[PDB]
A paper describes a structure:
The Type IV Secretion System (T4SS) is a potent weapon used by some bacteria to infect their host and can deliver effector proteins into eukaryotic cells as well as DNA and/or toxins into bacterial neighbors. In the Gram-negative pathogen L. pneumophila, the Dot/Icm T4SS delivers ~300 effector proteins to the cytoplasm of host cells, in some cases causing Legionnaires’ Disease. Central to assembly of the apparatus are five proteins that define the core complex: DotC, DotD, DotF, DotG, and DotH. The map can be divided into two major regions: an outer membrane cap (OMC) and a hollow periplasmic ring (PR).
Numbering used by the authors:
A (entry chain FC), G (entry chain EC): 58 to 161, 173 to 268
B (entry chain Fd): 56 to 161
C (entry chain Ed): 24 to 55
D (entry chain GH), H (entry chain FH), I (entry chain EH): 273 to 361
E (entry chain FD): 25 to 159
F (entry chain FK): 41 to 188
């Protein structure tokens, strides 16, 4: 059992070490990842973050012994389109949280290196889930622009209703526009209005 | 990019609104990720062009991030003009010396 | 030897932030 | 009328786990697996052969995602080779 | 002797990472190339510089309100007569100019820009009149 | 903890300034603007947009001097004395400035913009017009403002 | 622990020392601060202290996912216009209070000079807020006289009702003028009366 | 109808804090930050890039002032440089 | 209709204290002060400048008497010189 508390001594130290090493490995590629995850050049024209349209082709569901349901494609929107102020970077997704732990014989050494490898691939699976999450979000926004080009989703309908000078004698606001999103983006089920892309 | 460029053909470029010029064929190599105004003012200040803006600035900042190496200022401002899609627009009047940045009306 | 020209007295930070308050009230008074 | 699929399978068609899961430790093949509520979800590009899957999706690059019951082994076809895959949980 | 680049792609994962970065950058530039609406400069419909020597005075304006008062006293800054043609609506056409050494012809240019669709500016400099037009 | 230095120190700034001035690369520094003046014989050959291989040690110590500050836009411009034409002069000096800033951008500078240009002897520093790239009018010089 | 009460010993002594240094540093510049924060030449004519106007340009509020409100300018009236007898000096705002505290090994010394530096920057934080507060009140009164010149805010209306020889046999007042403010300054929200000031 | 902005942003468009606040310790940039009721206000001339603000104003000299949720790091743009900023609280 | 002034200022126009008071030792110039009930009353030939006086009378020979809130520091103009005086209470 002393091997086991040596292993959990090694686990959080290996996780914090791998978190630090991939933090400066992420910081080495910071302009490259800013070029990769250009969310700023994917927002809509009234500063709307576009929604995340997941795609699944070739879907089957065996409900019981007697009935299946197949569909050829499904498209599901998660994370619906909304007024963003500042567009998201990679660092809200991918930054692993670095603390440096100050919490400290032969089986201690070999189980602490086994725990160090467990902390290293545990932090690697945290990273694998993080680039999985940002690949999901950026691929869904790319797929929103694809299906808007294919006329499968509606664009969002803002309404800037204007107010002029607004308020009493103690507060004025001079050009007071209030902007709403009335229509959220949604998939149209009208099948005949779609666009089918050729190439050459 | 394939499905968007085949469902709408891009009929026009922006070289007819940003033409090349003498002291616009000076070259630059830019990494930049802030707002558009300091970048375009520095491009025009080293281009020896008077920089002016049209439109008041939006309250969300229009952000670009130009990361490229060794090209002239005309295609740098064309990349700035493309990266500011429907938010701002770079025009260059090379009969005078004006680099002008226009925001949008929303 | 390498030297920038104005080597004044040592300022302190009270007079520093008083100066960058005073320039803002100076040019706001000027445009008023 | 049966349900269409699970809508968790578009999340596990990427590598992102379902909300409130437990990861599973896949060994001997490029699959990932999560255990959500008495159901495991594998994300792979192998072909699942033995243990019976209840639902499946497939992305653009031949990644599949399978919803199945919790079996500790998985039989896959790699490239015509029958192989196995241990999970833990 | 020279040196390699400092944060070079000098590594078998990072060459694929930064090759993917330059690929997604130029594909971002061509999707921006297609959905960028441009205007041709012969059909841009904004005001030109009217090149009057009274209009080449370097002015300074910090103001935000209705376009009629700024154009009226920018007209009598330029010693121009000021005509308003059209009806001013109840919600006023609001502009915002904040520059502190700039020519008043280009100030007139970008209030014509900030008017846009709700108003328009004409300058007839031979008769030295400037007309704010509504719609 | 925040960092005291930015990987750089004032002793190494004055050491590289007096060593570059000992090498003949004149480092003027007026206020916050800085100016490194390189004669074109120290970098290129005669009327050529090609570096000599020994000049990359000079560009390595120029980029190690350029690492020491925090800047926004390095501009680098070149002019050489008149050879066959002003158009040949401007194409030669534009290629000379673009090859020296291609190496400086390949090296570590922390500038954001580098403005590379060449003029066709349009700013001569001396009315003596003694030769080609042995002339002190033939120079590439690197100017920036040290930000904060 | 003993280092922690060492730095708490050093903090109040350092902020009192930095308070004394900025006090006679203020008193060195005392006529310059009288010329800078000239509240006396900023009063209105019945010794009304003018109100402080705060300008906020480019205001945006993200209310939810679906609605934002922008305004191009806002003007706010804080600290409304009121009768002062004497004008405010700079010393009501800027003077930090100097007491000299009489409340007293190696880690004591190095933590008490870390505490001395924390007392120095905490006193500089209080000086930065005091310089900010007098900059806010003075730029507010400058913004009052600018928007009064631009006709964005109404001037105050006094009313000197005159009473003659009042009082009974036990007390008289010979010329009893009672002066009131009937109309406070307020921002006029009819927008067409505003005055655009060009220059040359 | 939404609210217009916060009208504490004209106070923090100057350097003066809100009434009843706690100051945060901005390191790594010329900003100040305060914390009034679960919201931090920064007074900057750097531009805020990552962590999302709920409201903003900007003075005549390009000082902005942002109302946001309590984030421990701010990502700013200085002059195209993308820097970070630590707060405490 | 507001009140006229205090009629205690007719007393403290010359040097006599108000009835039921407490004296206040003024240092740094020829001025005297009393404290009647949470307002201090000063008699001086200088003109006080900072702390805000609620009421004032002025004699035939130009001595002033002010009624004011109790401030420990009185700023004065002597003859254009700006001096301070401390009180105790």
């Amino acid at each position: 059992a002393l091997k086991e508390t040596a292993l959990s001594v090694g686990a959080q130290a290996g996780l914090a070490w791998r978190a630090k090493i991939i933090d400066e490995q992420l910081n080495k590629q910071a302009r490259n990842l800013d070029a990769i995850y250009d969310f700023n050049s994917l927002v809509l024209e009234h500063n709307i973050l576009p929604p995340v349209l997941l795609e699944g082709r070739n879907t089957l569901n065996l409900a019981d012994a007697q009935s299946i349901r197949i569909s050829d494609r499904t498209y599901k929107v998660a994370k619906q389109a909304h007024f963003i102020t500042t567009p998201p970077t990679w660092r809200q997704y991918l930054w692993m949280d670095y603390v440096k732990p100050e919490a400290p014989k032969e089986i201690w050494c070999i189980y602490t290196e086994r725990g160090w490898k467990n902390g290293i691939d545990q932090a690697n699976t945290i990273l694998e889930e993080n680039i999985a999450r940002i690949k999901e979000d950026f691929g869904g926004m790319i797929l929103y622009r694809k299906l808007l080009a294919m006329n499968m989703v509606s664009p969002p309908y803002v309404s800037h209703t204007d107010l002029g000078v607004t308020g009493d004698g103690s507060e004025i606001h001079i050009d007071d526009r209030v902007l709403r999103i009335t229509a959220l983006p949604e998939l149209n089920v009208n099948s005949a209005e779609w666009r089918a892309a050729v190439a050459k | 990019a394939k499905v968007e460029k085949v469902i709408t053909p891009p009929s026009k470029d922006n070289t007819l609104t940003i033409p090349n010029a003498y002291n616009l064929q000076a070259r630059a190599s830019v990494d930049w990720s802030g707002p558009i105004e300091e970048l375009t003012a520095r491009i025009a200040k080293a281009a020896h062009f008077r920089f002016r803006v049209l439109g008041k600035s939006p309250s969300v900042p229009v952000l670009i991030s130009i990361s490229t190496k060794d090209e002239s200022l005309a295609e740098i401002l064309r990349d700035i003009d493309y990266q500011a899609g429907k938010k701002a627009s770079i025009h260059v009047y090379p009969n005078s010396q004006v680099v002008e940045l226009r925001y949008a009306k929303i | 030897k390498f030297k920038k020209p104005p080597i004044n007295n040592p300022s302190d930070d009270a007079t520093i932030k008083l100066a960058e308050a005073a320039v803002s009230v100076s040019d706001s008074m000027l445009e008023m | 009328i049966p349900p269409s699929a699970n809508d968790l399978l578009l999340h596990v068609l990427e590598g992102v786990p379902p909300p409130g899961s437990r990861r599973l430790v896949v060994s001997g093949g490029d699959a990932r697996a999560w255990l959500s509520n008495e159901k495991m979800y594998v994300r792979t590009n192998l072909t699942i052969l033995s243990p019976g899957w209840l639902a499946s999706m497939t992305s653009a690059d031949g990644t599949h995602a399978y919803e199945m019951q919790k079996s500790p082994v998985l039989l896959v076809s790699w490239h015509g080779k029958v192989m196995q895959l241990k999970v833990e949980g | 002797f020279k040196k390699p680049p400092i944060n070079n792609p000098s590594d078998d994962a990072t060459i694929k990472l930064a090759e993917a970065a330059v690929s997604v950058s130029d594909s971002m530039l061509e999707m921006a190339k297609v959905e960028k609406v441009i205007t041709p400069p012969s059909k841009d419909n904004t005001l030109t510089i009217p090149n009057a020597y009274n209009l080449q005075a370097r002015a300074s304006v910090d103001w935000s309100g209705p376009i009629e008062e700024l154009t009226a006293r920018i007209a009598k800054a330029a010693h121009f007569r000021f005509r308003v043609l059209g009806k001013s609506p109840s919600v006023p056409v609001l502009i915002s100019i904040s520059t502190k050494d700039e020519s008043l012809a280009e100030i007139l240019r970008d209030i014509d820009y900030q008017a846009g669709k709700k108003a328009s500016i004409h300058v007839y400099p031979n008769s030295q009149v400037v007309e704010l037009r509504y719609a | 903890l925040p960092c005291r230095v930015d990987g750089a120190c004032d002793a190494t700034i004055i050491k590289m300034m007096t060593d570059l001035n000992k090498k003949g690369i004149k480092v003027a520094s007026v206020g916050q603007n800085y100016l490194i003046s390189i004669p074109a014989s120290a970098l290129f050959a005669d009327q050529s947009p090609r570096l000599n291989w020994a000049s990359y040690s000079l560009l390595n110590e120029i980029a190690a001097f350029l690492k020491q500050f925090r800047k926004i836009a390095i501009t680098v411009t070149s002019y050489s004395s008149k050879y066959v034409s002003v158009k040949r002069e401007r194409a030669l000096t534009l290629a000379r400035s673009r090859v020296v800033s291609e190496y400086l951008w390949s090296q570590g500078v922390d500038s954001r913009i580098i403005f590379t240009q060449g003029l066709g002897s349009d700013k001569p520093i001396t009315s003596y017009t003694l030769g080609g790239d042995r002339s002190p009018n033939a120079r590439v010089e690197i100017t920036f403002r040290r930000a904060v």
